[PDB]
Amino acid sequence: RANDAPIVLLHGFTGWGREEMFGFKYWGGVRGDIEQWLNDNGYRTYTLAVGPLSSNWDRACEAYAQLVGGTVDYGAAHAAKYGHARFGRTYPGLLPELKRGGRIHIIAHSQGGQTARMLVSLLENGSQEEREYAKAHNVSLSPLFEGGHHFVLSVTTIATPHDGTTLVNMVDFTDRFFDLQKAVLKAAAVASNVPYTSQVYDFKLDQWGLRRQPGESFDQYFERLKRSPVWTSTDTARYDLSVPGAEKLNQWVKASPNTYYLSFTTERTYRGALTGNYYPELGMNAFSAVVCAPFLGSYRNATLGIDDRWLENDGIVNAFSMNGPKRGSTDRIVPYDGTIKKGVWNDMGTYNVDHLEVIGVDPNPLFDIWAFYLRLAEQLASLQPHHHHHH
Ligand SMILES: [Ca+2]
Ligand SMILES: [Zn+2]
Numbered sequence: 001r002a003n004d005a006p007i008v009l010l011h012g013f014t015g016w017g018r019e020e021m022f023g024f025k026y027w028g029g030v031r032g033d034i035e036q037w038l039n040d041n042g043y044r045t046y047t048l049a050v051g052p053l054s055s056n057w058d059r060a061c062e063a064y065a066q067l068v069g070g071t072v073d074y075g076a077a078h079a080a081k082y083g084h085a086r087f088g089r090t091y092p093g094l095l096p097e098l099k100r101g102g103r104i105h106i107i108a109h110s111q112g113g114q115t116a117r118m119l120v121s122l123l124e125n126g127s128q129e130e131r132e133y134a135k136a137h138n139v140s141l142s143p144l145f146e147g148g149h150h151f152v153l154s155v156t157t158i159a160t161p162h163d164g165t166t167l168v169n170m171v172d173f174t175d176r177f178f179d180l181q182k183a184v185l186k187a188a189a190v191a192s193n194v195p196y197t198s199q200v201y202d203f204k205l206d207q208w209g210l211r212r213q214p215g216e217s218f219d220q221y222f223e224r225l226k227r228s229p230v231w232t233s234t235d236t237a238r239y240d241l242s243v244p245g246a247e248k249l250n251q252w253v254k255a256s257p258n259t260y261y262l263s264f265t266t267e268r269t270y271r272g273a274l275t276g277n278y279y280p281e282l283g284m285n286a287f288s289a290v291v292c293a294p295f296l297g298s299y300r301n302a303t304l305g306i307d308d309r310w311l312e313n314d315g316i317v318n319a320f321s322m323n324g325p326k327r328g329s330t331d332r333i334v335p336y337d338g339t340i341k342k343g344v345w346n347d348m349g350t351y352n353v354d355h356l357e358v359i360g361v362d363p364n365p366l367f368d369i370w371a372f373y374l375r376l377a378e379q380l381a382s383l384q385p386h387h388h389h390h391h
Contacts, residue, residue: 002379005103005153006044006095006114009035010063010137012110012160013177013237015107017200018026021207024067024188027109031360031369043377046094048376051182051204053225056249059115060122061349062088064144067104067151071092073142073250074207081236084207103153105380107373109359110317113160113263114240116152116247117325154260154380159355161317162263164246166299166306167292168238172232176291177238180224180316183287186216193216205230243304246321247328255331257343258382263378265322265331265347266314268354269297275347280309284354285362288315316355323347340379342387 004060016036027034027047038045048066050059058074065072065088072088079086095104110114110280124149134141143149146286184190190200196216205211208230212221230236239245255261268288269278280289296313300306305327312319324333324345333345340346352374356362360369 002384003148003153003381004044004101005105006046007105007377007378007380008049008067009037009045009323010106010108010116011049011052012108012113013074013111013241014052014110014111014181015049016052016125016236017150020049020199021185021188021190021201021349023366024190026361027359028369029187029314029356029361030245030352030363032307034360034369034373037370038373038377041374043381045163045377049204051106051230051237053230055237055362056111056240057235058088058120060119061144062204063115063119063310064123065089065093066091067094068098069076069096071329072206075127075130075133075145076137076139076233079135079207082233083227084229084235085209088206089204098151102151103385104122104151105154105156105383106121106152106298107156107158107376107380108160109158110160110355111237113155113157114246115253116155116157118249118253120152120155120256120259123151124256134351152256152259152384154262154383156262156264156376156380157321157322158316158358159266159314160263161241161246161321161322162250162292162329163321163327164243165201165241165246165317165321166243166296166301166310168242169297169299169301169304171291179291180287181222182218183285184356185389187356189275190218194218195220200332240388243306243327246325249290250325250331253325255343255345260340260342260378261324261345262325262336262340262348263345264358265350266317266353266355266358267312267319267350268314268352269293269319271312276308278313280315281352281354281371282355283366284315285356288354288356292316293360299358314354316337316359319350336343340383342354
């Protein structure tokens with residue numbers, strides 16, 4: 001070990017706390033419990049749960065308070081712009097050590113990779129618009145928006161749509177996306193047509209004043225959410241997930257020079273010789289395979305900049321999006337050569353695993369999930385806090 005910074009796990013547009021979903025773990029799913037696996041092997045590991053459907057910003061603010069402790073502060077400018085509450089939940093703080101020079105590695109899956117990047121950006125640089133708004137209106141300002149925080153030694157992204165996913169361009173994306181939430185609920189053996197009195201799956205929609213009501217099944221809940229500002233606003237995961245939304249985000253969310261970045265690309269497809277299109281591989285999660293992959297492997301859009309390079313996918317995200325932000329980005333991406341460089345995206349390669357298989361939510365006995373996350377842990381723990389120059 002060159003370092004002793006704990007690992008923090010972070011989910012995407014689906015994800016829940018360790019105590020949610022009757023203990024079925026987002027990180028591990030039907031395979032087991034990834035956090036616990038890592039801890040047992042001697043790598044300190046924690047798990048964040050933030051709003052699945054919320055924007056990367058809201059999630060960044062939630063991640064921060066959850067780490068250091070306090071009441072989630074979304075920023076006054078941001079809250080005024082989008083019309084939700086400035087303050088959210090209160091958290092004990094997973095690691096108050098952060099307020100004392102300590103650091104962390106973030107391992108992020110799916111859209112959690114956008115969130116992680118933005119958290120690094122906000123920690124380091126704060127928000128100019130938030131600082132000016134506070135100066136002009138005399139409102140208080142969260143320390144997240146002042147700049148100067150150095151918590152993150154590294155960020156690792158796994159199947160992250162850094163340039164968005166063409167999934168959002170499906171004519172029926174709205175129904176299909178919530179069908180995706182019902183699919184993951186099903187995986188954990190939770191029904192979507194039952195009005196469970198227990199919380200089960202909290203979408204943490206406190207800023208929007210949205211919550212599942214007594215006598216409301218997840219089917220009925222999702223129908224309301226579809227018509228709510230968490231689905232219709234630009235301050236949403238839905239928007240950040242799109243190609244143009246991802247590009248917007250990339251235009252201000254830059255790689256920190258003091259931080260290591262690792263990206264893992266995922267795919268579960270084969271190419272058809274006659275069509276040029278990609279198709280779901282045998283074994284891909286049932287839902288992706290019928291619903292999502294055929295579109296992802298065949299959808300082109302000349303004006304949007306979606307060509308052939310975008311067709312390979314993992315059932316949910318186009319592989320070409322995952323190695324790092326590129327569209328609207330100045331971030332650099334360098335293929336892993338054996339030396340993890342800092343201040344750049346280290347493309348660790350492409351793995352034959354579909355979205356949900358990489359976190360164990362879908363079975364794949366051919367994928368050694370434990371060896372994957374352990375090797376990763378070993379790698380992050382070998383990162384040198386400081387690197388001098390040499391021949
Ligand atoms: Ca599978
Ligand atoms: Zn917001």
